[PDB]
Design a binder for these strands. Structure first.
Lengths: 89, 90
DNA sequence: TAAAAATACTCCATAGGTATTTTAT
DNA sequence: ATAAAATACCTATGGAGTATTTTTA
């Protein structure tokens, strides 16, 4: 598990398309699709419904998404706050 | 950045040695150093002091450090709960 | 001075790309 | 029929290794 997997996962959910996700992320659709499989096979959990356009989360997906964005958000504050402090000497 | 960078950094700080943390993480010391460099380099900050046997954080480090340990703990939480749901136990 | 951290490469595992097929409209 | 996702294969960036040179206690 890396932030990469989350950020990728989040892009899929928000955008409801590996394609549109892959565009926004500036990578191709397959490698994206593989990183999602990887995430899932690592958790042994199915995060996205297979067999439907648009692309929708499973109950577990939705739970995970919720903690994903909150957790990515927290990384971003962690970095900001840290930079402000590097101006104290 | 990535969780690898955090976990590594945390390891380092906890051991107060790159060398001790290296094999703690089952990797070599030199790559470790580089990862920690890139981290500081990406943030454009100095998270560790520029030289001390008992290697210790800067202020920026300490803050990051504690926050890091909270985030990694978050990732664990996230995984446990999802797992917990997936397993069929609410 | 003798430990521990930093270079200077080498190697390879794997994230990312290309071509094609399969599935779901 | 036709676009998007899945599958297979290939490439190449950077994570990890070995040998070696700085460091600072």
């Amino acid at each position: 598990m890396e932030l990469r997997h989350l950020r990728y996962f989040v892009a899929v959910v928000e955008e409801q398309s590996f394609t549109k996700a892959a565009d926004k992320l500036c990578i191709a659709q397959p490698p994206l699709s593989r990183q999602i499989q990887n995430l899932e096979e690592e958790l042994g959990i199915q995060l996205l419904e297979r067999g439907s356009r648009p692309v929708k989360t499973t109950p577990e997906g939705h739970f995970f998404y919720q903690y994903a964005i909150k957790l990515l958000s927290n990384v971003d504050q962690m970095v900001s706050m840290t930079k402000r402090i590097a101006s104290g000497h």
